[PDB]
Design an enzyme around this catalytic site. Structure first.
Site, short mmCIF file in Angstrom:
data_model
loop_
_atom_site.label_atom_id
_atom_site.label_comp_id
_atom_site.label_asym_id
_atom_site.label_seq_id
_atom_site.Cartn_x
_atom_site.Cartn_y
_atom_site.Cartn_z
N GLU A 121 -1.63 2.34 4.45
CA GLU A 121 -1.55 0.87 4.61
C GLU A 121 -1.47 0.50 6.10
O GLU A 121 -1.92 -0.61 6.47
CB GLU A 121 -0.37 0.33 3.80
CG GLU A 121 -0.51 -1.14 3.46
CD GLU A 121 0.08 -1.58 2.13
OE1 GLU A 121 -0.42 -1.13 1.09
OE2 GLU A 121 1.04 -2.39 2.15
N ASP A 130 1.26 -11.96 8.17
CA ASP A 130 0.41 -11.65 7.00
C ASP A 130 -0.62 -12.79 6.87
O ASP A 130 -0.57 -13.71 7.71
CB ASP A 130 1.24 -11.38 5.74
CG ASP A 130 2.14 -12.52 5.29
OD1 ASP A 130 1.96 -13.64 5.81
OD2 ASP A 130 3.00 -12.27 4.41
N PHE A 214 2.54 -1.59 -3.96
CA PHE A 214 2.49 -2.11 -2.57
C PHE A 214 1.10 -2.69 -2.24
O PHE A 214 1.03 -3.58 -1.38
CB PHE A 214 2.88 -1.03 -1.55
CG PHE A 214 4.30 -1.11 -1.06
CD1 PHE A 214 4.69 -2.08 -0.15
CD2 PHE A 214 5.26 -0.20 -1.50
CE1 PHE A 214 6.00 -2.15 0.31
CE2 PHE A 214 6.56 -0.27 -1.05
CZ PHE A 214 6.93 -1.24 -0.15
N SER A 227 -4.55 3.94 -18.21
CA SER A 227 -4.24 4.88 -17.10
C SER A 227 -2.72 5.11 -17.04
O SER A 227 -2.30 6.27 -16.93
CB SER A 227 -4.80 4.39 -15.79
OG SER A 227 -6.22 4.48 -15.77
#
Ligand SMILES: COc1cc(/N=N/c2ccccn2)ccc1NC(=O)c1ccccc1Cl
Length: 414
Positions: A121, A130, A214, A227
């Protein structure tokens, strides 16, 4: 004779002697049980050698009553001061060593998650915004929702504990990331779709799930219903095959390949990333410090009978308070590291119990300061105090393990 004091209308001595004896039996039981079943995963997982020191401490705690309720002889004033000071020092020196190591292991565990997401990240060491526009630093750590950059600097400085001037280090970003992990892991356990999967997974594959959270948030990771179920059933190879079909894999293939590979192997292979005899020596040192304090005071204020079943000695307030203080520091350290490691699931939630033990021990020891000093029956309050603190440690720490060994041999599995 405590029986004679009972006949006369005073049952306190006999009570104390009985409490102490039931204490010794219980400790002898617990010990011999741990020896016999030492090879099993509930004794062999923890520090078997520190437990012997914790049990000796408890044992000697109960034995104190036999120097407090004793015939007037010189050595029993010597053993009183050894026992009442050294028994807690044995239990909590061993315990603080155990809890400190749990805390260093926890710290080093959180470092891998941080390295994982640094690679996946990124990381900025100076303040930024952000895509909303709110002041952020490190691995997407939110500072404030205020348009003031000074507010951001203000809350950053508070968060780190120096004037940063809006700039931090890798280790201060790690520190901040650990709040964001804990936050994210709370969201996960509040979330009915993700909660059972995170529960199932080993530490490494939890790192993988937190990674996805995240990137896409909770509601996004809940998309991968099939999954998620495949991973719960520990069907690694098939979970990888399925996730490799996702819009996620096709939109960020580089990061997805690494997270997926980590779900397959349960290893760190896809990314760029405290002794045993040490603990005995550290525990032994922490205990000799308490011996030093007691032996020092034996020279400053030699033991002597005052002048009868209550053996009354010359022991002055400094003879009581100096070891009390050191025992108090040991307790406060134990409580600190215990609380830090309270949710660590290792060794059948050994950490949950130790945290509970220490919380109790603090209220007990803090309670018996005004109680003891305010009291005119000090030998008796000292008797019940030591035995009670020792029963709490035996109760909250050892019974839960002896229970699983004896009652639940099937759950006694790695
Ligand atoms: C809480 O009471 C005590 C317990 C003690 N051992 N417990 C043990 C002993 C072995 C294992 C676990 N736990 C030792 C001293 C104690 N009290 C004191 O020395 C004391 C003296 C004066 C004022 C306050 C106090 Cl708190």
């Amino acid at each position: 004779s405590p029986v004679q004091y009972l006949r006369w209308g005073d049952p306190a001595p006999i009570a104390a002697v009985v409490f102490a004896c039931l204490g010794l039996l219980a400790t002898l039981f617990v010990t011999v049980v741990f020896i016999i079943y030492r090879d099993t995963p509930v004794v062999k997982s923890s520090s078997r050698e520190l437990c012997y020191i914790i049990l000796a401490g408890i044992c000697l705690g109960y034995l104190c009553t036999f120097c407090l309720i004793a015939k007037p002889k010189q050595i029993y004033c010597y053993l009183q001061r050894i026992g009442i000071g050294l028994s807690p020092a044995m239990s909590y020196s061993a315990l603080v060593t155990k809890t400190y190591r749990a805390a260093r292991i926890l710290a080093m565990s959180k470092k891998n998650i941080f390295e994982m997401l640094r690679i996946d990240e990124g990381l900025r060491l100076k303040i930024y915004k952000d895509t909303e526009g709110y002041y952020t630093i490190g691995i997407g750590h939110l500072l404030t929702k205020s348009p003031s950059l000074n507010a951001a600097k203000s809350e950053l400085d508070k968060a780190i504990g120096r004037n940063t001037n809006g700039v931090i280090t890798k280790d201060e970003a790690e520190k901040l990331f650990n709040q964001d992990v804990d936050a994210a892991v709370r969201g996960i356990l509040r979330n009915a779709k993700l909660k059972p999967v995170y529960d199932s997974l080993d530490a490494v594959r939890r790192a993988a799930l937190i990674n996805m959270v995240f990137q896409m948030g909770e509601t996004g990771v809940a998309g991968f219903t099939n999954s998620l179920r495949m991973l719960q059933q520990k069907r690694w190879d098939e979970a990888a095959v399925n996730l490799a079909k996702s819009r996620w894999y096709n939109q960020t293939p580089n990061r997805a390949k690494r997270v997926i590979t980590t779900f397959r192997t349960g290893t760190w292979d896809a990314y760029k990333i405290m002794s045993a005899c040490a603990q005995l020596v550290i525990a032994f040192i922490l205990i000799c410090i308490q011996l030093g304090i007691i032996v020092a005071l034996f020279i400053m204020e030699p033991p002597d009978i005052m002048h009868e079943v209550y053996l009354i000695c010359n022991t002055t307030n400094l003879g009581v308070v100096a070891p009390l203080g050191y025992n108090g520091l040991l307790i406060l350290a134990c409580t600190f590291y215990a609380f830090k490691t309270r949710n660590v699931p290792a060794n059948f939630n050994e950490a949950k119990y130790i945290a509970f033990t220490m919380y109790t021990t603090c209220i007990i020891w803090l309670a018996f300061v005004p109680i003891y000093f305010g009291s005119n029956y000090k030998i008796i309050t000292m008797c019940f105090s030591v035995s009670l603190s020792a029963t709490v440690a035996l109760g909250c720490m050892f019974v839960p393990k002896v229970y699983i060994i004896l009652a639940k041999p099937e759950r006694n599995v790695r």
